[PDB]
Design a protein around this ligand. Structure first.
Ligand code: A1EHG
Length: 147
């Protein structure tokens, strides 16, 4: 059982079973629900000093470490999941991608166009679903599949 990409896990802190997707890095308490030619995604990118281009509209020289970037991503995911903040709001303010000006929207795309870990996570997400941290040569992404 379980849709592909998904595995059963156990919370270290509560002992309750949860589910983890090793393609999207998503995790959820509910047993998961379950390929299109194209998907539409938004994303929030946090770059780091080893990003292919360690620069963005937010910062001419991005100096943070991969670990600092993952902490920031993790914090954004927490606030999005709690509802304290909207994905679109955090992407507009803090995404190191030029798509920040479009609330993170990348428009629609096919397989073959995006960096592979991003593509795989995008196509494995269900409509409306959000990824966990997804790593590419650009940095660390939160991906929201919108279509
Ligand atoms: C046009 C759009 O939808 N998104 C966008 C805007 C600026 C840079 C990159 C982008 F993906």
């Amino acid at each position: 059982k379980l849709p592909p990409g998904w595995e059963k896990a156990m919370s270290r802190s509560s002992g309750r079973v949860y589910y983890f997707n090793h393609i999207t890095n998503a995790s959820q308490w509910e047993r998961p629900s379950g390929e299109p030619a194209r998907v539409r995604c938004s994303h929030l990118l946090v770059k780091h000093s080893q990003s292919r281009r360690p620069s963005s509209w937010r910062q001419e020289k991005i100096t943070r470490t991969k670990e600092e970037a993952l902490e920031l991503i993790n914090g954004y995911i927490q606030k999005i999941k709690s509802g304290e903040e909207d994905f679109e709001s955090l992407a507009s303010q803090f995404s190191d991608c030029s798509s920040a000006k479009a609330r993170g929207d990348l428009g629609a795309f096919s397989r073959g166009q995006m960096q592979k870990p991003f593509e795989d996570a995008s196509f494995a997400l269900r409509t409306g679903e959000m990824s966990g941290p997804v790593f590419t040569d650009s940095g660390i992404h939160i991906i929201l599949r919108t279509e």
